[PDB]
Amino acid sequence: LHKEPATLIKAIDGDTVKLMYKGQPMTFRLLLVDTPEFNEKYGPEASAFTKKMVENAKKIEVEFDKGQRTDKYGRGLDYIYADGKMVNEALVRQGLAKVAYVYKGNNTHEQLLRKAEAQAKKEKLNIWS
Ligand SMILES: Cc1cn([C@H]2C[C@H](OP(=O)(O)O)[C@@H](COP(=O)(O)O)O2)c(=O)[nH]c1=O
Ligand SMILES: [Ca+2]
């Protein structure tokens, strides 16, 4: 897979962010994870976590996987990096997202994320508390 440039437009919630990509505004949904909705328990903490990560980043990158690049809503499906750190993984590692929505063909980082989830759960962090 390949990292490509993007710039933040605005944090939306734990697992959706608006970025400019190839010069066009696009809403991106993070591959392989599910954060709680803002209305749910840990939703506000997930939103805040993503928001801090993407806002503080000097460099945002997006990475498509091998499959569908957009979902049925027209959201981009990607891994997003903030100064080289994957948001999708970081959310999981901190118990603020579950590994989820694993579709065959767009699952390159599956086992990386599952490993993070196991550690978050060991530590009983947040969602796993
Ligand atoms: C993460 C992801 C979500 N989706 C779709 C499935 C879900 O459809 P439904 O809307 O019919 O439930 C929805 C979940 O996203 P959200 O968790 O943002 O709601 O997005 C994909 O199609 N591909 C993906 O890789
Ligand atoms: Ca969600």
From Swiss-Prot:
<feature type="active site">
    <location>
        <position position="37"/>
    </location>
</feature>
<feature type="binding site">
    <location>
        <position position="15"/>
    </location>
    <ligand>
        <name>Ca(2+)</name>
    </ligand>
</feature>
<feature type="active site">
    <location>
        <position position="75"/>
    </location>
</feature>
<protein>
    <recommendedName>
        <fullName>Nuclease A</fullName>
    </recommendedName>
</protein>
<feature type="binding site">
    <location>
        <position position="35"/>
    </location>
    <ligand>
        <name>Ca(2+)</name>
    </ligand>
</feature>
<feature type="binding site">
    <location>
        <position position="34"/>
    </location>
    <ligand>
        <name>Ca(2+)</name>
    </ligand>
</feature>
<feature type="compositionally biased region" description="Basic and acidic residues">
    <location>
        <begin position="109"/>
        <end position="125"/>
    </location>
</feature>
<feature type="region of interest" description="Disordered">
    <location>
        <begin position="109"/>
        <end position="129"/>
    </location>
</feature>
<feature type="active site">
    <location>
        <position position="29"/>
    </location>
</feature>
